[PDB]
Design a protein around this ligand. Structure first.
Ligand SMILES: Cc1ncc(C[n+]2csc(CCOP(=O)(O)OP(=O)(O)O)c2C)c(N)n1
Ligand SMILES: Cc1ncc(C[n+]2csc(CCOP(=O)(O)OP(=O)(O)O)c2C)c(N)n1
Ligand SMILES: [Ca+2]
Ligand SMILES: [Ca+2]
Lengths: 678, 678
């Protein structure tokens, strides 16, 4: 039962959001208006602690329809989080804690949303991670993990294919604790949904194996909303979708019109809303004391006490199960096992020629038992990406008979974008989870919508991208990347590793895993590559270094991945003609650029022509090279070696180009491209 | 009535795909083995003319499951297309006409496929275009258009969200001539579909508004398959999906196993299949004269006859409706109206400041009535993109009451990936279709999969990408592009226009609309930008040009979009301190590089330091400038102006950088970035 106070609270949220959008004269007021009742109802029965937004067993909420942020901020403020009326007053202004879309960095905000379809998929991640933590640490008597994941979504999210891939997989995995509430308001930007969206949403969701509950009166039926949620919590075998009907901008003179969607209400309209809901049409940002008292009482005080009972249970747990408790305590601190990297493979020149894709498999087998937080998977390319260790158990529902929730290997299906957002969700769940997803490097491009958010928010997720170039061969240009690495090297805060051998692959994982705010992409080859003389984890961890050196080089060859070997052979052919070439290996732009300038310039100095070698686009190389040898046209079909010779990438071919670069520059003094003038 | 000859034909096809994959010792034999029966039944009743693959009223077929090419190639050769056994004998080999995945340049091959989800989405575009052409030119007594669009797909395309997107739009539009046949084989790379894809596809498609039919013995029931297709053609108001159950690799000692999915069969295995099927186990690429004759009798000759009939009826149309006949006749030849380019707007330095986003709207207004083949739209951003002319009618089913099929304005909803793919289908259709679609620049990334293929295939589609930068403002970083253009400028064959003003917007549309093999992206501004003195359609069409000139400049400033004007103001500032700046506008890298070197070199000459200016990633600028002033970090939520000032993009701020640049190179000898050594 709700009372007069719940109605006042619902009324304090609606108006506080309006006031928050109006002042910025920028924003979306509609969804927050139409969603206040459901939000009040939902947040009151959510187990959380405004005082500790990181408590691990806290019910997690996600505003997938990111533009309704105003709503979110209102709730965070009213319920006790560190967000004041002042912050609300600097909404959408440069440098405030209240940007136009929820940002992962703010306490109370679980992921960064805004881009449609991304929030709902993150939520699937947060439920897979929960299912796993629970199955891995819960013991009879100690229920350390049992939280739920709540999502708020709109028509847009449901139209973005990414939420379909995610939802399909969520139905398969039988995620009972995932409860999604849909803002069934019948409007989007272009107007009415019937104009391009008249499908049977509930029917499409039942086909995924989800349960669908209806709430016809989302505008006022508090009892029914609270009841829909309750019913949803009893079906632990099917995720639940609640189709709740509401009127966008409810309370405004233009309720139900798309005008209220993405624009502040007219001052005139803001006044009546307030008079209507019983407020003073002349005051702004007014929160009745009784509302504060109510939330302290029903949410903050209880939530705080729930966190207290939990911590001491965890104390008893650590006494009862030392090994498992110490491990969980470690993951909770965010620290990786001690000296874990000591288990990383190393090699020498006498070792065997092996494609880095294979070398990658061997790191996974060696470290998976050292890092209980490593949960991996592939998007239907497991036998190609070699992303699965041997003694692995698939993460599946107990009823599958092909695994269970304690498992750490995920079968994403042919769903690259959803994998991207789901891994973002796993990482964001907490407990030091370290997800990795595999697929072909040219198809990582299908997940750019999510890959950007891992960088923007800083979710350190790992993409194991095999088949990095025309080394793919026969599959042809539809499968050979050309522009991928250049694209990602152009996106801020993301490591794009292209290791050249066993040691460079170890450096890739060491850096990739130790990272706490920077995702990574490891581009691996299909074809066998030899072990280089000069490579090492220590050097390679710096992103770029000098593989082979010569006193007073006539030219410097900068290469990456499969091309470092070719370059080493090109140099041999060059020594033959008395030309001294220094060979620099650059496994990651990101990590290299992070080294102090004095190191970088010792690697790429003045007074020597620098030419770069890589079988892909040359558009990003100007920052380190004087002349670039690469590909700026689509690949071809045919045996891989025949294709490489076709493009000029043979030892002599590169050598010839080195010579032309030296002659072109004789007499000119050169300056390292690393030197910026401002 | 299917007879022994129909059974012989089907065997010849299975064996032919098998011989084809095996000599290549590379390829996917599974689906070709399993879909031979459907391929035979379907093509036998498809209205096509193998001698002229461009007849506009031909029935269209799209192998969405691109990996099953050997099936498409076998069909092409048997039915009388220009493709031979020697070609098939060089399948997957360098420079051959038989690449590992179907390519748009080959006759008989409707569009390029390989990446999952694209093919089924294109077929939708092709069916809309058919609906349009029919509704636009059909007259009582002259059914010029009425062809069907058949598609072959598998679990993979059904798992990729782009297909959920496209099929959701297909059902809304009631695309009745769109018949899809799903290879329901229970297997995918990782293994059994129950492992990660157990949804109720039939129930889901029914929710979209499609009709679902079933054929449970797709391995040997030529009868049911035909009945399903005929039943399909009866529902002229709903697209149909036929769930045809097959066994992967039928005939093989490993049918039903996934080891026959993407690997060639064993020599011993190929033998038992030939014997089992009545063929000789020791011979290759054998086609019984009976099959050639059969397909000549039932497919080629009747289709040729039909093309001829259509040809005669078309000259009657041209006689009856001179104006309309003249129009289609022109479109089917591929010529744009004569002198159309005279209807493009031009401005002068004295015309008010307009956003490049608004200017774009003005062009749409002006050319819409000139180009009947211009079909446009938006992905739920019509009011923000300004992509709809006033007197426009939407493309919809007549029963809607919102428009009809003859309309030219498509409402895509929030489905960016599907839109670029549907655009590819429309363009692919023919009749000089000129589709365009709008969305915020940042989310074009969500559609990267389709875009790559627009470039790869050479489809001249157009993206009206608006809100091109931090100029967007308060929406913040999840909505401001940084890497986007640098990404798309690293992809081969695609124009990335970023017009600075009125004249440059026209130059952008002229070249874009005149393009026959290169797609486009026109990055438009959210904010107002002044008309420049010195810009002009003619010059901007070259992609780059000296906007302002000075004798003996101390520095050359290169900019694009909204930074050209900022650069012009900085030059004023620099002139006051007696520093001569030449300002160059580079509206499009693609177009620029297409110009002769000596012209390019006149724009970016030796001996002068060059500095570029653009509020996006600097990574791609090294091929033109010595020093770049750009933004290599994510953006910010704030008032546009404040964001610009916060990042340093002010008149004196650029001038200050130019001065440091001049200082840094004083005395040095400088070479143009354009000059390459090899
Ligand atoms: C990926 C992506 N595509 C497009 C946009 C632009 N966009 C923002 S809101 C929206 C649609 C309205 O969505 P809905 O969830 O229906 O809205 P509500 O009624 O809840 O405001 C559009 C097109 C975006 N935010 N994300
Ligand atoms: C976008 C994209 N993702 C992934 C792949 C790799 N891929 C090729 S075949 C396939 C799996 C098989 O799909 P299905 O439609 O089940 O084919 P079948 O084996 O039944 O013929 C995948 C993952 C691809 N080609 N493109
Ligand atoms: Ca809505
Ligand atoms: Ca399959």
């Amino acid at each position: 039962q709700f009372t007069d106070i719940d109605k006042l609270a619902v009324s304090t949220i609606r108006i506080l959001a309006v006031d928050t959008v109006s002042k910025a004269n920028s924003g979306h007021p509609g969804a927050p208006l139409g969603m206040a009742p459901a939000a009040h109802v939902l947040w009151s029965q959510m187990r959380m602690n405004p005082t500790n937004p990181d408590w691990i067993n806290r019910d997690r909420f996600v505003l997938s329809n990111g533009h309704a942020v105003a709503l979110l901020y209102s709730m965070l403020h009213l319920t006790g989080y560190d967000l004041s009326i002042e912050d609300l007053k600097q909404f959408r202004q440069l440098g405030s804690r209240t940007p136009g879309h929820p940002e992962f960095e703010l306490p109370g905000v679980e992921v960064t949303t805004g881009p449609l379809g991304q929030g709902i998929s993150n939520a699937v991640g947060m439920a897979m991670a929960q299912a796993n933590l629970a199955a891995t640490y819960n013991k009879p008597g100690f229920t350390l993990s049992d939280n739920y994941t709540y999502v708020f979504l709109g028509d847009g999210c449901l139209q973005e294919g990414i939420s379909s891939e995610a939802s399909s997989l969520a139905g398969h995995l039988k995620l009972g604790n995932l409860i999604a509430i849909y803002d069934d308001n019948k409007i989007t930007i272009d107007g009415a949904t019937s104009i391009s969206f008249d499908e049977d949403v509930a029917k499409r969701y039942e086909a995924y194996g989800w349960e669908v509950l209806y709430v016809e009166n989302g505008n006022e039926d508090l009892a029914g909303i609270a009841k829909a949620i309750a019913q949803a919590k009893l079906s632990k075998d099917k995720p639940t979708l609640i189709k709740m009907t509401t009127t966008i901008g409810y309370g405004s003179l233009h309720a139900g019109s798309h005008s209220v969607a993405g624009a502040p209400l007219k001052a005139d309209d803001v006044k009546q809303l307030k008079s209507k809901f019983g407020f003073n049409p002349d005051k702004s940002f007014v929160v009745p004391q009784e509302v504060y008292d109510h939330y302290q009482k029903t949410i903050l005080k209880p939530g705080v006490e729930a966190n207290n009972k939990w911590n001491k249970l965890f104390s008893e747990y650590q006494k009862k199960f030392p090994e498992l408790g110490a491990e969980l305590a470690r993951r909770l601190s965010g620290q990786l096992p001690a000296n874990w990297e000591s288990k990383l493979p190393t090699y020498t020149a006498k070792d065997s020629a092996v494609a880095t894709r294979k070398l990658s498999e061997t790191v996974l087998e060696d470290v998976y038992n050292q890092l209980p937080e490593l949960i991996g998977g592939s998007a239907d390319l497991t036998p190609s990406n070699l992303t699965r260790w041997k003694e692995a158990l698939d993460f599946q529902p107990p009823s599958s008979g092909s695994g269970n929730y304690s498992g750490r290997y995920i079968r994403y299906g042919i769903r690259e974008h959803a994998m991207g957002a789901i891994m973002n969700g796993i990482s964001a769940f907490g407990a030091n989870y370290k997800p990795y997803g595999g697929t072909f490097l040219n198809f990582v491009s299908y997940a750019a919508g999510a890959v950007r958010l891992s960088a923007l928010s800083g979710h350190p997720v790992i993409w194991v991208a095999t088949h990095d170039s025309i080394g793919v061969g026969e599959d042809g240009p539809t499968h050979q990347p050309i522009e991928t690495l250049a694209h990602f090297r152009s996106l801020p805060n993301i490591q794009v590793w292209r290791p050249a051998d066993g040691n460079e692959v170890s450096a890739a994982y060491k850096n990739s895993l130790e990272s706490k705010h920077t995702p990574s992409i490891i581009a691996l080859s299909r074809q066998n590559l030899p072990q280089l003389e000069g490579s090492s984890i220590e050097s390679a961890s710096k992103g770029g270094y000098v593989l082979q050196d010569v006193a007073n080089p006539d030219i410097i060859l900068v290469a990456t991945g499969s091309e470092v070997s070719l370059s080493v052979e090109a140099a041999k052919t060059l020594a033959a003609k008395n030309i001294k070439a220094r060979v620099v290996s650059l496994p990651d732009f990101f990590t290299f650029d992070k080294q102090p300038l004095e190191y970088r310039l010792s690697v790429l100095p003045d007074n020597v022509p620098i030419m770069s070698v890589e079988v892909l686009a040359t558009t990003c190389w100007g920052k380190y090279a004087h002349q670039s040898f690469g590909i700026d046209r689509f690949g071809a079909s045919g045996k891989a070696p025949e294709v490489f010779k076709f493009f000029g990438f043979t030892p002599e071919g590169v050598a010839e180009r080195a010579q032309k670069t030296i002659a072109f520059y004789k007499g000119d003094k050169l300056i390292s491209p690393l030197k910026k003038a401002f």
